[PDB]
Symmetry: C2
Subunit: 301 residues, 2 copies
Amino acid sequence: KALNFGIISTESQQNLKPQWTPFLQDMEKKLGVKVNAFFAPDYAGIIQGMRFNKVDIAWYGNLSAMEAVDRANGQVFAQTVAADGSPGYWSVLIVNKDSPINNLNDLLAKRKDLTFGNGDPNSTSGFLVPGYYVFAKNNISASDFKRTVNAGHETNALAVANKQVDVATNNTENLDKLKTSAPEKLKELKVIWKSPLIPGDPIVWRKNLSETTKDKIYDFFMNYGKTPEEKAVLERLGWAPFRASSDLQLVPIRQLALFKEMQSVKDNKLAKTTAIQAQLDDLDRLNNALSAMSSVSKAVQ
Amino acid sequence: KALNFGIISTESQQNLKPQWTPFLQDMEKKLGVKVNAFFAPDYAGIIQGMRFNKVDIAWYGNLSAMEAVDRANGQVFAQTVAADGSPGYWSVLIVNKDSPINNLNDLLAKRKDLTFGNGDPNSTSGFLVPGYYVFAKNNISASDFKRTVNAGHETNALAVANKQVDVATNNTENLDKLKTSAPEKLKELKVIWKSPLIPGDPIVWRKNLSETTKDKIYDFFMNYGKTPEEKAVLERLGWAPFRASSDLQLVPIRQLALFKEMQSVKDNEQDKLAKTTAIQAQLDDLDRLNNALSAMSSVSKAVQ
């Protein structure tokens, strides 16, 4: 039998395969089943792929994971851990080093005369986060720009670098990826804005996978990275060994999405605002619980 | 609009009310709404009460909270904390001091000539925890005693005390409540067996309460105990200030209930197969969730 492992379109296939192919062959080696990379032109392709069971396991951002959870019978089971021990990563806006656009106030003032590279609409760092803090908060909108395009991170970072779009979203992980796939191009970019912290990406599976397959997948993730060859495979990817995780890691990204929905709703007391405040309160209370939690042993068998 | 507050039948009403009346009156005073105690003869009355929206918020043990989450649209929002700093409480078996039973081996050999006081079938410490570690692990059940009866913690401790039943379940918190209500009855008791750690009791509400009511209850619980008067009320209950909690506190009791179910099933053939594998699937899920909870760090909280 065979497993299909979804890879989000952060970068071109040609640039993802050197990082991924060796990880997937090792997954093949340990599991004793064939493992195929499953690519798509946008995050949506992976999410729908999982919904129709063409994807079994996937690397997602928190937003595309949340969607998979909500729409595609998905479930978080591990979390990536940045190799340098960053507690997460960050969203950015970039422009070419030669731009006179130096910051948000410049961008807000000039937006109707600029070309904008917006992110994949299911991207956490690419779409949602700048969507809230830069756009929603300043009640400006992406439609304002002379020209606006939703594109993957590499695409946006290369278009800025090549002076082909004035400004774009990106993230700090993908900028380090660019260091490797196109170093002279990274030299051409300037970060003009940086979001608050975003948590590491989840690995997610479909919940109708057999218990045996779930076990094998979970054991593989939890145990990868102990030998020199595996440790290497992880570094290329930007990662130390995975951490156990659950849908709970998604919480602030749910909060962020509801913050943004509220800004929108008010800009248009409404029932809608109460249904959303309900949801916010639920997440606030759960956040308090998570911080207050002491210890958690296995119930002694 | 009146709020019904459920209180499990650990003790008699008359021993509950002086702990609970001051607490519910301060809650009325703070919330600006009428609060009424809801009692019932067994734990099931509280859980079923909430299921049909007759109980709005309740003090439960872990097991009965679990089934209020599964049956009664419940949700944990706070956890009680022992006043003396204990991280939890313990289940026990108790006999009269005059009895020669001194432990589990002493008990099991003689089990045929003994009368046994089991717990409320929805009680964590009364029924589940002994039902697993004493009964399932020693491959016996409560019917393997000469006579078996199901009762609340105070009923059981008073029956052992008055030499009306030879051995019963109880817990260390209730023994403390009996030291208060019936001190001359407590000194007649001796503990012969003690369970692993049980986590503090949660406070639970029904999820279909208005978000407004939920917010005011939540604020009430998180802020109670600032003044000498509130401190005294908590003290009477044997509690310090509450802490934020969620359904997540219930994971080890879900584990334990499933461990027990798997053993009960082994000892009731196609139907055993279908059930165990459904049980095992639930345990693997809880296992992964537990590993996730121990690995978490300084929780990420959206910056508005």
